Amino acid sequence: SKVTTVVATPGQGPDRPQEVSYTDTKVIGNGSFGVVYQAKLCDSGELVAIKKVLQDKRFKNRELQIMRKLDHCNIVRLRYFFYSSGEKKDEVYLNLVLDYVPETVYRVARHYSRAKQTLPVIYVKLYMYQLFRSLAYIHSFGICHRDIKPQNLLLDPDTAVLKLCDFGSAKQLVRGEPNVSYICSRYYRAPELIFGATDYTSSIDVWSAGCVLAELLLGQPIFPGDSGVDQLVEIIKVLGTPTREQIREMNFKFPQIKAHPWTKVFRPRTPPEAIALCSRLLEYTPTARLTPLEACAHSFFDELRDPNVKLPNGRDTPALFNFTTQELSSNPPLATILIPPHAR
Amino acid sequence: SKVTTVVATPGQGPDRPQEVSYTDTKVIGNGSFGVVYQAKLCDSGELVAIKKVLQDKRFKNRELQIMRKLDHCNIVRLRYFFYSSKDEVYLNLVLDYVPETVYRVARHYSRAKQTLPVIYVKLYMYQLFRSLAYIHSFGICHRDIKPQNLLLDPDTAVLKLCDFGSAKQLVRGEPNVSYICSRYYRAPELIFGATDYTSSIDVWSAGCVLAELLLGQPIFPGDSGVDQLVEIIKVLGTPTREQIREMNFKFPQIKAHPWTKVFRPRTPPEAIALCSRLLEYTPTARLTPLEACAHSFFDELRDPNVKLPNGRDTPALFNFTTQELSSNPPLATILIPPHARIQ
Ligand SMILES: c1ccc(CNc2nc(Nc3cc(C4CC4)n[nH]3)c3sccc3n2)cc1
Ligand SMILES: c1ccc(CNc2nc(Nc3cc(C4CC4)n[nH]3)c3sccc3n2)cc1
Ligand SMILES: [Cl-]
Ligand SMILES: [Cl-]
Ligand SMILES: [Cl-]
Ligand SMILES: [Cl-]
Ligand SMILES: [Cl-]
Ligand SMILES: [Cl-]
């Protein structure tokens, strides 16, 4: 087959480029951002995904700057990056060489959905815990993801490892500076984003994470809608009509619906700790939502802290407990809960 | 067979209650609004659509108060309306049933690697600009324009605008929620969260329908506001600081992609022209509904010879009221062709 050789910069190291050669190139992905290729590195034989984007040249790439800062077992690794022009008007492209990961939570959820099965609660636990860890970490640097949705949660089905990807909307949120309210994909947008607020916090990611939890339990999206009006009605149908207090803390012709009791929303064989968790992730008032770390520590995740827990495929669980000081900074006293007696 | 009989108020005219009996009740639609039943009237055998909705005890239903003032050949007729019954009260809207929708028609053609013949595009788009010219005449904005909300009669080629659930009168200086309109058909001012938007949002949406029927697929798709604005910039070029001012800030600098690359080879120039004039960053730089009716793309409809493919007459395109033309009366001299003046 054909071989490409580029001079590429490692993501973690100090700016010291080396000759990286790769082969078996194929398209996998399209969209606003640009294209994603898959390839095999010639030296290692490891598979990589290459996200090719257009570069301003005017300003430096915010995705690239944020990803160089990040090192976490539950976030896709940037191995290298390199520039190519190919054949556009002296147009320049930034190529991000990332880890290849052979599945996504979107693809998996949909296999169980179009089989009228429900994803076994154990996986729901493994995947939602590793997401909340990845948020705990990036929230500690004040970085908000702003795009949290199933398509952006990579899985290795053999190791049960989840890896957060797609930092193209990610931004550090400084209290008092405003931010655009038109980020986050439809279905997972926080009510304050729908109401057009520009003084929102990292809590938008917690609401999005809650919408992923509900969807893995129900086997389909919980707040669907082609418009915001449609979206708000599906929310008010579950949380009821926000009070004057609650509206004021988000950002006015609202129908009076009594709150549908939470236990009546999910199928009946659904664990009540999974429901408690939802009620505490999907709150109208952003400041009343759990923190990523507060979530990791919820009784819903207790099975993962059992010393005998094993994967359905018979392998051990992946890293769940190797917390850093950084990751715990939000609230260190929780370490006594997050790190169980048996853990190294 | 089963038979429901109610006492209904008429939608148009004065308040003289009437007995209405229908049968073959069937569900045809579910969603946030409530339920849409099809039914067959006992006496006439005519098909109707009943839209059942939760009635606030607080204030009277706005969709109702609006639809009762509306009488136009390109807007679904409200035949009757009644209150009924969860242990609280529902508002029902008895409306003409119309057997097709642009959504369905667009899709039948789309997955058969086919575009809809341009003649139907002209007919359907023309009748839509007429309906907007009418409601805008009253300062009422629809705020939902999308293919699913455009009813069709495949045989007559009559298009009817439905769903006045988001519709509202826009007074200047009064603000309005920016979270109305359906993904794909939202004007950039709504994506940017603006609350001083005018009826020109309806014109942007209409323009997305035009472009979609021509292209065979939506033109500005994406799961997020951001993804949409990228598809918009890949076609219109980068908004200038003045353009952004007129809607109300770190955008990828990209050149305006010539509008003729956008459409398949043999697309009418005049179709492409009308798009560039509906899909403008600057809300006030967009054609009014009535100005679009009079665009050269619609010239073929004004031809006295014009026939539908099945050999039938086109429907009523020229019977304009004073109410309809108040946006700009002089336009009557293009809108009403010579052959429609003949006594
Ligand atoms: C969002 C949009 C596009 C993509 C690329 N599509 C994709 N990526 C995969 N893996 C992937 C992407 C990446 C880098 C872009 C993050 N690493 N690994 C896999 S595994 C089975 C289907 C599939 N589709 C991923 C997320
Ligand atoms: C918007 C919302 C709900 C619907 C109901 N679904 C529906 N309605 C139709 N016609 C319809 C609706 C109406 C009034 C409720 C608006 N009149 N005629 C037709 S004809 C072929 C499929 C179909 N589906 C239509 C548009
Ligand atoms: Cl995916
Ligand atoms: Cl991506
Ligand atoms: Cl439809
Ligand atoms: Cl047709
Ligand atoms: Cl409707
Ligand atoms: Cl003539």
Q: Given A31, A229, A233, which is nearest B227 (Cβ)?
A: A31
Using an 8 Å CB-CB cutoff, list chain A residues near B88: none
Sheet-wide strand order for A103-104: A103-104, A153-156, A161-164
Q: Is A262 helix (H, G, I), strand (E, B) or coil?
A: helix
- Nearest Cα neighbor of B259 from B210, B222, B201 is B210
Which of these is catalytic: B87, B144, B223, B299? B144
Is B43 a known active-site residue? no
From A48, A81, A98, A154, mutation site for ligand 1 pocket: most ligand atoms within 8 A of C-beta:
A154
Q: In 10 A of CB B202, how many CB atoms?
A: 27
Distances (CA, A) of A119 to A106, A309, B37: 12, 17, 35
Contact criterion met (CB below 8 Å) for A106 and A151: yes
Q: Does A195 touch chain B (CB under 8 A)?
A: yes
| DSSP three-state, residue A326 | helix
Report the interhelical angle of A203-218 vs A272-281 (nearest 10°).
150
- Contact in structure between A26 and A37 (CB atoms under 8 Å): yes
- DSSP conformation letters of B207-230: HHHHHHHHHSS-SS--SSHHHHHH
Q: Which of B13, B142, B129 is nearest to B66 (CA)?
A: B142
In B, residues 94-133, which contact A (CB 8 Å cutoff)?
Answer: none
Q: Cα dihedral angle (A281, A283, A287, A293), rounded to 10 degrees?
A: -10
Beta strand ranges found along B102-257 (DSSP E): 140-141, 150-152, 159-161, 168-169
Annotate A193-260 with DSSP letters as a single string.
Answer: HHTT-SS--THHHHHHHHHHHHHHHHSS-SS--SSHHHHHHHHHHHH-S--HHHHHHH----------
Catalytic choice (A147, A166, A306, A316): A147
Asked if A32 and B191 come within 8 Å (Cβ–Cβ), the reply is no
- Residue A156 corresponds to which amino acid? D
**Resolution of the coordinates, Å:** 2.6
Closest atom of ligand 2 to CA, residue B96: 17
Nearest residue (CA) to ligand 1, atom 3: A29
> For residue B132, what are the contacts with CB-CB under 8 A and spacing of at least 6?
B142, B145, B161, B199, B202, B203, B206, B289
Q: Which residues line ligand 1 (CB under 6 A)?
A: A 28-29, 36, 49, 51, 76, 98-104, 151-152, 154, 165-166
Of B26, B27, B35, B36, the one to substitute when testing ligand 2's pocket (max ligand atoms within 8 A of C-beta) is: B36
Beta-bridge partner residues of A50: A37, A97
A30 close to B (CB below 8 A): no
If DSSP codes are grouped into helix, strand and coil, which group holds residue B10? strand
Pick from A183, A201, A289: which is nearest to A239 by CA?
A: A289
Answer for the pair B234, B257: CB distance below 8 angstroms, yes or no. yes
* C-alpha of A111 from chain center: 20
Residues A242 and A250 sit within 8 Å (Cβ to Cβ)? yes
Q: Do B179 and A232 touch (CB under 8 A)?
A: yes
How was this structure obtained? X-ray
- Domains of chain A by start residue, with CATH: 3-99 (3.30.200.20), 103-338 (1.10.510.10)
CB A183 within 8 A of CB B225: yes
Strands B47-54 and A47-54: unpaired
SS (H, E, C) A12-51: CCCCCCEEEEEEEEEEEECCCCEEEEEEEECCCCCEEEEE
What is the distance between the alpha carbons of residues A254 and A229, in angstroms, rounded to a whole number? 10
3 state SS of B64: helix
The angle subtended at Cα A121 by Cα A120 and Cα A122, nearest 5°, is 90
Strand-pair partners of B21: B5
Which SS3 state, helix, strand or coil, does residue B233 take? helix
Task: Report the distance separating Cα A70 and Cα A133, nearest Å.
Answer: 13
> How far is B135 from A75, CA to CA, in rounded Å?
52
- Computed on alpha carbons and rounded to an integer, the radius of gyration of chain A in Å comes to 21
Contact indicator for A98, A50 with CB cutoff of 8 Å: yes
Which residues contact residue B119 at a Cβ distance below 8 angstroms, ignoring those fewer than 6 apart?
A: B300, B308, B309
Using CA atoms of A297, A298, A299, A303 in order, give the dihedral in degrees to the nearest 10: -50
Decide: residue A245, CB within 10 A, 0-12 exposed, 13-18 middle, 19+ buried.
Answer: exposed
Please tell me if residue B60 touches chain A, with a CB cutoff of 8 Å.
no
Q: What is the rounded CA–CA span in Å between residue A207 and residue A283?
A: 8
How many other C-beta atoms are found inside a 10 Å radius of the C-beta of residue B256?
12
Residue with tokens 């003046």: B341
**d(CA A122, ligand 3 centre) in Å:** 22
B218 CA → ligand 3 middle, Å: 21
Contact residues, chain B, for A229 at CB < 8 Å: 32, 166, 179-180
Give the DSSP letter of residue B317. -
Tokens of A214: 């509900």
Residue type, B243: Q
**Alpha carbons B132 and A93: distance in angstroms, whole number:** 44
Say if residues B228 and B186 touch (Cβ distance below 8 Å): yes
* Residue B49, Ramachandran bin (φ over 0: left; ψ between -120 and 50: alpha; else beta): beta
CA gap B339, A328 in Å, rounded: 80
Nearest CB among B182, B195, B226 relative to A182 is that of B226
Nearest Cα residue to atom 21 of ligand 2: B100
